[PDB]
Design a binder for this molecule. Structure first.
Ligand SMILES: CC(=O)c1ccc(OCCN2CC3(COC3)C2)c(NC(=O)c2cc(NC(=O)c3ccco3)cc(-c3ccn(C)n3)c2)c1
Length: 116
């Protein structure tokens, strides 16, 4: 029955998002929503039905749309799963995604233990 205030969640969780943003070049494919037309991948929305990216997740943190830490974590892993799904295993974005996933697991595990 534990209650999380929006600012309590933002303060605990926003550093883990900032850690993803700090990965350069690995975060560059993920800082804005995929634009299938600009990127030259017009089939993207045929395959990815629930797009997610760092900027969307940041706006949900900034607007209190997460009531529970796991809802935040779900959006981060939705972003990873999208990239692993759409992109080939040998591709730039897949490998960049795998790097972000490792960085995220490191940053989030101590925060989940302290939150709860
Ligand atoms: C999320 C997902 O499933 C997905 C699929 C395919 C994608 O792309 C298709 C390929 N095209 C990207 C290129 C390579 O160059 C453009 C070929 C992307 N998107 C990127 O891969 C990307 C990469 C950089 N850049 C560096 O990865 C990099 C490494 C070293 C130097 O720069 C930037 C950006 C970007 C978009 C807007 N902005 C301001 N920036 C996007 C994302």
């Amino acid at each position: 029955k534990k209650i999380f205030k929006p600012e309590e969640l933002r303060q605990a969780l926003m550093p883990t998002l900032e850690a993803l943003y700090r990965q350069d070049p690995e975060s560059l494919p993920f800082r804005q929503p995929v634009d299938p037309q600009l990127l030259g991948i017009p089939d993207y929305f045929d395959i990815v039905k629930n797009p997610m990216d760092l900027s969307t997740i940041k706006r949900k943190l900034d607007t209190g749309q997460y009531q529970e830490p796991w809802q935040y974590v779900d959006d981060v892993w939705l972003m990873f799963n999208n990239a692993w799904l759409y992109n080939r295993k040998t591709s730039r974005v897949y490998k960049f995604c795998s790097k972000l996933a490792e960085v995220f697991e490191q940053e989030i595990d101590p925060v989940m233990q302290s939150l709860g």
